[PDB]
Design a protein around this nucleic acid. Structure first.
Ligand SMILES: Nc1nc2c(ncn2[C@@H]2O[C@H](COP(=O)(O)OP(=O)(O)OP(=O)(O)O)[C@@H](O)[C@H]2O)c(=O)[nH]1
Ligand SMILES: [Mg+2]
Length: 348
RNA sequence: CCCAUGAGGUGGCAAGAAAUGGGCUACAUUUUCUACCCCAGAAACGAUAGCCCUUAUGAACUAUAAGGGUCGAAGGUGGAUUUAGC
């Protein structure tokens, strides 16, 4: 049930649970969860994550990985309700313990859709602006990480419309504060710091890691429209174009991880979870090869271990449920689906 | 009536100072918007009326119907009573 070694893991004991620290919650990943599960763990008041077979296999990949090889690309995909993104957060935890520069985004659905104010950029042309989300992710990355910002030492300058500029040998904490102070050019600040991360090709001072959730939103059309009642293409958006031009496998110093999510998929049908189906033709042309990782449903013993975890937490107040017929009907109606399992144990 | 009270061809007639009836709309968050029709994300709504334009057929669109831009209120769940339903 419970595990005493949270950082290191093994295959021998599967379905185990390992506790984590509050500083690891608030510093490593304060954003990269669904708000449902965020509040769910807040109500837990006891942060314990479960081990997964594909998670351990991906960790084995990371353990057996050379950075002289090109930047490897991993894609997690489940059946719309598995633990793909939670295993991605587990990878984030492992790499943070490994002391790498991790940049993790909450979701790209929020980027491509639901912008309160879409703007002619001055740093470029033929490009809208995502200022609010830019500053949001900027302060998000600041909260995620500090010595890295202090020691980044950008070897290039950047002027600004605000009668100011930034010169060599300065830490990009100052551009982080720029974007947090004013949000208009925060999109340009983000699209510039992302390029600056790769501007250092050696990456000996740190090792770069990219973590993406809802990758399906990155490849696909937009719901936004132009004020003249005209559609908007995804590549026209500032952040979309920046990210697309940016993640290319050109830095070749580690790995990047992305996860699929159909719950927020737009212009796509229900009960569709195949990678090719989600990322489309343009996605396959963007990254023809990659490491697909199928995140299957819970195993039997892992399922019973999760039940025992809930019982130790006294999550199920229905005290006639801990019995053979109750468990049978429970996992029969659940079909080992983690999300509906969480829902059922929540409202039971 | 049967040089008409019959017959033929042009036009408009067919509006509301007003009262009432049947139906539609919404007066909210079980609501409104976005892809799917149900595990998501936001707002904290309401024009099938009017003005302008486009489209459907007609010989005839001032306006008949549908669509687009604007207008973005009344409205905050009903004054007796009363209607339909096993
Ligand atoms: N404790 C624990 N819960 C898990 C694990 N894997 C899946 N779950 C449960 O399953 C739910 C789904 O996990 P998510 O990764 O957030 O789901 P998702 O990948 O976003 O799925 P979609 O976005 O709908 O496509 C979680 O909220 C958990 O309740 C796990 O390894 N440990
Ligand atoms: Mg006509």
């Amino acid at each position: 049930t419970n595990e005493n070694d949270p950082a290191k893991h093994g295959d021998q004991h599967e379905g185990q649970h390992y506790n984590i620290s509050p500083q690891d919650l608030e510093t490593v990943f304060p954003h990269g969860l669904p708000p449902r599960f965020v509040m769910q763990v807040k109500t837990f008041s006891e942060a314990c994550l479960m081990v997964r077979k594909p998670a351990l296999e991906l960790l084995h990949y990371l353990k057996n990985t050379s950075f002289a090889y090109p930047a490897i690309r991993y894609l997690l995909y489940g059946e719309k309700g598995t633990g793909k993104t939670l295993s991605l957060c587990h990878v984030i935890h492992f790499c943070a313990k490994q002391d790498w520069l991790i940049l993790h985004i909450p979701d790209a659905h929020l980027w491509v859709k639901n912008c309160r104010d879409l703007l002619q950029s001055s740093y470029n042309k033929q490009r809208f602006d995502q200022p609010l989300e830019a500053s949001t992710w900027l302060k998000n990355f600041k909260t995620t990480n500090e010595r890295f910002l202090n020691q980044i030492k950008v070897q290039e300058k950047y002027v600004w419309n605000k009668r100011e500029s930034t010169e060599k040998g300065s830490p990009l904490g100052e551009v982080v504060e720029q974007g947090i102070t004013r949000v208009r050019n925060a999109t340009d600040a983000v699209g510039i710091v992302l390029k600056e991360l790769k501007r250092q090709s050696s990456l000996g001072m740190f090792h770069l890691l990219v973590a993406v959730d809802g990758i399906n939103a990155l490849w696909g059309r937009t719901t936004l429209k132009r004020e003249d009642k005209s559609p908007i293409a995804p590549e026209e958006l500032a952040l979309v174009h920046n990210l697309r031009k940016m993640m290319k496998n050109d830095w070749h110093g580690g790995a990047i991880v992305s996860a699929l999510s159909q719950t927020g998929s737009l212009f796509k049908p229900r009960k569709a979870y195949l990678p090719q189906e989600l990322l489309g033709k343009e996605g396959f042309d963007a990254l023809d090869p990659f490491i697909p990782i199928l995140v299957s449903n819970y195993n039997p013993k892992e399922f019973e271990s999760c039940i025992q975890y809930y019982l130790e937490n006294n999550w199920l107040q229905h005290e006639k449920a801990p019995t053979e017929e109750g468990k049978k009907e429970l996992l029969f109606l659940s079909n080992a689906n983690p999300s509906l399992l969480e829902r059922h144990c929540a409202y039971l």
